[PDB]
Ligand binder design. Sequence first.
Ligand SMILES: Cc1cc(-c2ncccn2)cc(C(=O)NNS(=O)(=O)c2ccccc2)c1F
Ligand code: NA
Ligand SMILES: [Zn+2]
Length: 268
Amino acid sequence: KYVDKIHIGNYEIDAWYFSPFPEDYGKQPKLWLCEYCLKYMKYEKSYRFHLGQCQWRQPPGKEIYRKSNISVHEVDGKDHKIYCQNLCLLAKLFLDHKTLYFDVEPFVFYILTEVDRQGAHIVGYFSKEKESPDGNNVSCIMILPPYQRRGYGRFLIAFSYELSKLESTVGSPEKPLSDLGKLSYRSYWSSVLLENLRDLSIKDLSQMTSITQNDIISTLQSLNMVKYWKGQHVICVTPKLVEEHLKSAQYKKPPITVDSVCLKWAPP
Ligand SMILES: Cc1cc(-c2ncccn2)cc(C(=O)NNS(=O)(=O)c2ccccc2)c1F
Ligand code: NA
Ligand SMILES: [Zn+2]
């Protein structure tokens, strides 16, 4: 019997996938998680006692972004091992393809929180390899179900690329992407590219955005905005067709934007 249900903060969330919590934790009808330190517990009573005790009111690590009540914390896997393992076990409940939960030292974790008077409430996160051979600027990205499809995943995608800009490199999410992940990345790529084409080679779009040329090319193909000439992809779009795509229905929700001004981060 697996963990099939968690209580975190004020949310109950049904599990989507097996997550390797220890065998005695799985057997419980529900798992109780501290929304601040991510300690997981077997009983409501141990949960209630911890809430009276826990002094954390936000993630560990450094707050590398804060604009209004949106906050991102950078947490090194080697400096906060238990916390990051707890995060991974939490995320595996909603990630089918995630494989790594306890070997957290090679990763840095970017924790997205929504702040009120009580504290900084976890929304989701992405992990990133400290040294990515394959040039992946995201390893795993996960938004908790009650926050999904509300702008936070796009924010985190944009944030991963702002980091990639500050490192003077391009990056791509590690594959395979979840079903929701595929649509979010394609939607974000289109928006970023279409907005740059309204205001340029493919290599230029790559350097302005840190999106890989492959990701650019495939996004333009799905928009039917690239020509092929003797082995080379070439952008072929009119400023009118860009705008038709841009004012269409799906680009209408006002994003949470990443203000690079509010990003306090220097490249490793
Ligand atoms: C990358 C990603 C992953 C996951 C996820 N979560 C749990 C388990 C597995 N994957 C959820 C979201 C999400 O929430 N997407 N919706 S969106 O942020 O509003 C949005 C709108 C327009 C363009 C882009 C994004 C997401 F973006
Ligand atoms: Na649920
Ligand atoms: Zn706690």
